[PDB]
From a paper:
In this study we present cryoelectron microscopy (cryo-EM) structures of the ribosome from A. baumannii in complex with the clinically relevant antibiotics amikacin and tigecycline, solved to high resolutions of 2.8 and 2.6 Å, respectively, allowing comparison with previous apo structures of the A. baumannii ribosome (Morgan et al., 2020). The overall structure comprises a large 50S subunit, composed of 23S rRNA, 5S rRNA, and 28 ribosomal proteins, and a small 30S subunit composed of 16S rRNA and 20 ribosomal proteins. These constituent parts form the recognizable structural elements of the ribosome, including the central protuberance, L1 stalk, and L12 stalk of the 50S subunit, and the head, body, platform, shoulder, and spur of the 30S subunit. Therefore, for each structure, the 50S subunit, the body of the 30S subunit, and the head of the 30S subunit were treated as three independent rigid bodies and their reconstructions refined to nominal resolutions of 2.7, 2.9, and 3.0 Å for the amikacin-ribosome complex and 2.5, 2.7, and 3.0 Å for the tigecycline-ribosome complex, respectively.
Additional density for tigecycline was also seen in the 50S at the central protuberance. Here, three tigecycline molecules bind in a cavity between the 23S rRNA, the 5S rRNA, and protein bL27. This is accommodated by a significant conformational change of the surrounding rRNA, with a particularly large movement by U2308 (G2319) of the 23S rRNA, which flips out to interact with the 9-t-butylglycylamido moiety of one of the molecules. The three molecules interact with one another through stacking interactions and through bridging magnesium ions, as well as with the backbone and bases of the surrounding rRNA and protein bL27 (the three molecules labeled 1, 2, and 3). From the 23S rRNA, a carbonyl and a sugar ring oxygen of U2308 (G2319) form polar contacts with the 9-t-butylglycylamido moiety of tigecycline 1, the base of A2309 (U2320) forms a pi-pi stacking interaction with ring D of tigecycline 3, and the base of A2322 (A2333) forms a carbon-pi interaction with a methyl group of the amine of ring D of tigecycline 3. Finally, the main-chain carbonyl and Cγ of Gln74 of bL27 form van der Waals contacts with the amide of ring A and ring B of tigecycline 2. Additional interactions between the tigecycline molecules and the surrounding phosphate rRNA backbone are facilitated by coordination of magnesium ions, most clearly seen by the ion that bridges the phosphate of 23S A2309 (U2320) with oxygen atoms of ring A of tigecycline 2 and rings B and C of tigecycline 3. Protein bL31, which also forms part of bridge B1b, is partly resolved in this tigecycline-bound structure but much less well resolved in the amikacin-bound structure, so it appears that these conformational shifts make bL31 more rigid.
Numbering used by the authors:
A (entry chain Z): 1 to 44
B (entry chain A): 2 to 273
The structure:
RNA sequence: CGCAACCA
RNA sequence: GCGGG
RNA sequence: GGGUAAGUUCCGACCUGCACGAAUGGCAUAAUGAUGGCGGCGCUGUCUCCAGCAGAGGCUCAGUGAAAUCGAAAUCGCUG
RNA sequence: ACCAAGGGUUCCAGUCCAACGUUAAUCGGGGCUGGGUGAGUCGACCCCUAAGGCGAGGCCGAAAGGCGUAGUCGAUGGGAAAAUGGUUAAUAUUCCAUUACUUCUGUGUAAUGCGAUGAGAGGACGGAGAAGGCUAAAUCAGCCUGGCGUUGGUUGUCCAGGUGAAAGGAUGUAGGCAUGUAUCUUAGGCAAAUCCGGGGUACUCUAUGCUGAGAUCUGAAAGUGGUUGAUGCCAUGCUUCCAGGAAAAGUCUCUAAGCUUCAGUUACACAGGAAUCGUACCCGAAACCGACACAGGUGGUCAGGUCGAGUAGACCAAGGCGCUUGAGAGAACUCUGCUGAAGGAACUAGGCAAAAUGGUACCGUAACUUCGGGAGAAGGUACGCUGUUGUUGGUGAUUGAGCUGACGACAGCCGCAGAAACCAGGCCGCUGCAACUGUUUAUUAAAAACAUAGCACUCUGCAAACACGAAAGUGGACGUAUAGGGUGUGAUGCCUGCCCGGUGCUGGAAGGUUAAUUGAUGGGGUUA
């Protein structure tokens, strides 16, 4: 069967990347939350 | 005119095609075409705003001169051409100084014929004139509504309007819908009827022919569930409801014109 | 007979 | 509570 | 009525239509359908009624090694 | 076998076997140690743009923000240039050899107008089909080298192996396209133009230019001919059809501005450069997506022989593998197959499943039909090998040899069977439903359901109806009533009766009833 992941690094970086998160208020709140938790990776 | 196809397969039995031996077989005039991408009926927000739209052949937009603002210069017809964007044919005019333009072809216009614009233009099919200088009872097409804007009315393949009579700064014309309207006499019209004129005798013959024109299939609201259409639901076939649109507007006879700004220009509407 | 008013 | 019969 | 030795199905009729019916279309229709029903020729292990044989498991040996379940068990029949 | 994606060292070598590997393991995609990826030409970066995104100002919005102009990004598309051979344990169009090519710099020499952010041309493009010319490739022959056969024969008309150097340069053919040239002139090209477009003349249309596969020449132990022949190339060509088939830059022409004896341009010569990143390895996979070394999934490219229409199929080549538990035994029972007396659907809800049919050529083929079909209807005949004899086609050494395709006629030979294995329609009669091809419940429903061409009703006069959105605005549509939206019906044939009381809708407006508003009257409270 064809499964749901189907990787593509360009699409990953354009949907969930750092600059994609920094481009909106909600994504910057995502970044603030993950810094508050102390995550070692902020984004994909 | 119209050619019926032999039933050599079930999808050909009812294909009535329109055939014109005088249309230019070849590439359009390249300086006058531009790209025209398909919308799918999606707006700014990416939402579908017009259903049943999508697919179809790739098409270029031909730049048709609707304003005809090159007055006093005679022009000669080079060729009549297929225009995928509309139902009428277009004529490629070569003006007397070398400029090339596209216009909506009149009914009997052929290669080699001469057209002109302005106040002085003779009465001749394809000549653009202000409604002051048109004779009463004439058959017109490509009619302005605002001064200087360009032809807006009677542009489809067999369209034409009747000039019924001028009184003051307004000529009264009759439209194809059966409606009597007034237009400022400074608006321009073109003499004659629009070209193609057997466009409505064709028969697509099969579903794929409609798909080639960018039409997607229509689903009846009767065939839906209540969550999707006000006609939806029911055990078996049921339409126990006054017919209505997907958004709940009545579909048989209910009038939807609400523009009060231009109502004083309508002398007599249809249905009278 | 209809139109409209109804918060023990 | 306003008209009709 | 036909078809079968024998037909609640099928086909053709009849009309007493519980409760058909004309664009929630009526009645037909060549072609088409992995569409529903019925019949026939061929062909057969579908069957009468199963027999033999081939390979793969099963079984025994060596190696590795699960699962659901589980109150505890010294966990038979019959009649009540 | 090779790429992209994805992975990320799994690649190679030495060493180790606890764990991992569905068993053992000395082995490994496991552990430890070391090594390995070489580019002006390959790809990316870069220049250019599509869909789309972001978007100075701007418009809109309680705020957050939304849309969008100028612009700026964004490949899945456009834009320079390399071949052959050799080499490592592991890289090679990258290293080496040989022979090329592209584009930049400078430094000169000789000539002299250079020209943009503007204008024009070009890049620039669909489906299908066909004829030809070619080439790769394959095969046979020739040539070179070796061989003389465990068992009859094998010094030949025998056996086996090997053996055809590319890019590039020159040349400019088969083919394809445009009539070209000169001169005068000019309501166009945001202003200019010697340029493009438009006019007029004279000669030309057995003329000029562009383009162009391949051949030839060159490169440069055997190393040369034939046949067949592409899906590759000419060819972004040609013909035809309608549903009418990206953009921008690089490129070329022109002038504006600006310079001017310079700078810039272009011809040549000399010298020097072409950065950066990727490059190992895996690709129907044990390395990617599926929790696994998982019978699944994964885009593109290459793809030989015999027979064959074929990329089907059987057996093989190159290449790669034996699928990471085996050994016995040969019970019931289960699975997967093969055969089966006599019968032949009696089975069963139901011929479910199996069996059967099956190729090529020729003969023959009903009802019905929308004249196309039905139809491969149904059904029947022949088919192997050997020899003899005929017609014919294609290439074309020297008109026509050698090689090769097609079609027959006779005669014989053999078997149970000649379509020999593999491969490869079962058919017919009556009937309901849906015209038809399509679509659908990913994962128990493929259908009579949905759609459909056609039909009808209705709305819509354009700042359209309608939809999305808070608005700005966007779609409808760069469309204009032969159009667009909604609703039902559903090819076609013949047709489609009656009812306007109810509920809708459309028209009408005499009267009744009726909101905010307005505030006449009357009543009260206060007290000079
Ligand atoms: Mg529609
Ligand atoms: Mg439903
Ligand atoms: Mg509802
Ligand atoms: Mg019902
Ligand atoms: Mg029965
Ligand atoms: Mg009914
Ligand atoms: Mg009726
Ligand atoms: Mg009805
Ligand atoms: Mg029976
Ligand atoms: Mg006991
Ligand atoms: Mg290894
Ligand atoms: Mg072990
Ligand atoms: Mg290892
Ligand atoms: Mg924006
Ligand atoms: Mg701003
Ligand atoms: Mg860019
Ligand atoms: Mg790309
Ligand atoms: Mg390697
Ligand atoms: Mg094509
Ligand atoms: Mg011997
Ligand atoms: Mg770089
Ligand atoms: Mg490699
Ligand atoms: Mg493989
Ligand atoms: Mg799984
Ligand atoms: Mg395995
Ligand atoms: Mg696998
Ligand atoms: Mg095969
Ligand atoms: Mg038997
Ligand atoms: Mg028998
Ligand atoms: Mg029975
Ligand atoms: Mg029985
Ligand atoms: Mg069956
Ligand atoms: Mg079978
Ligand atoms: Mg159907
Ligand atoms: Mg189907
Ligand atoms: Mg499906
Ligand atoms: Mg299902
Ligand atoms: Mg199913
Ligand atoms: Mg229906
Ligand atoms: Mg019908």
């Amino acid at each position: 069967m064809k499964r749901t992941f189907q990787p593509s690094e360009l699409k990953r970086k354009r949907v969930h990347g750092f600059r994609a998160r920094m481009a909106t208020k909600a994504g910057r709140q995502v970044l603030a939350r993950r810094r508050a938790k102390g995550r070692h990776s902020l984004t994909v | 005119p119209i050619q019926k196809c032999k039933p050599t397969s079930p999808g050909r039995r009812f294909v009535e095609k329109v055939v014109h031996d005088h249309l230019h077989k070849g590439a359009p005039y390249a300086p006058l075409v531009e790209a025209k991408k398909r919308t799918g009926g999606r707006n700014n927000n990416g939402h579908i705003t017009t259903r049943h739209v999508g697919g179809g052949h790739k098409q270029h937009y031909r730049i048709v001169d609707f304003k005809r603002n090159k007055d006093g210069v005679p022009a000669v017809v080079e060729r009549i051409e297929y225009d995928p964007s509309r139902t009428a044919h277009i004529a490629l005019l070569k003006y007397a100084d070398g400029e090339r333009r596209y216009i909506i072809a009149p009914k009997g216009l052929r290669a080699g014929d001469k057209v002109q614009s302005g106040n002085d233009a003779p009465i001749r099919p394809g000549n653009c004139l202000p409604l002051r200088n048109m004779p009463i009872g004439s058959t017109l097409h490509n009619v302005e509504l605002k001064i200087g804007k360009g032809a807006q009315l009677a542009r489809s393949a067999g369209a034409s309007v009747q000039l019924l009579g001028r009184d003051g700064s307004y000529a009264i014309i009759r439209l194809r819908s059966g409606e009597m309207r007034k237009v400022h006499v400074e608006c321009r019209a073109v003499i004659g009827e629009v070209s193609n004129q057997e466009n409505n005798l064709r028969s697509l013959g099969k579903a794929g022919a409609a798909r080639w024109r960018g039409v997607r299939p229509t689903v009846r609201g009767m065939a839906m569930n209540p969550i999707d259409h006000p006609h939806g639901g029911g055990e078996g076939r049921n339409k126990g409801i006054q017919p209505v649109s997907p958004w709940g507007q009545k579909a048989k006879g209910y009038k939807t014109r609400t523009n009060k700004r231009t109502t004083k220009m309508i002398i007599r509407d249809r249905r009278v």
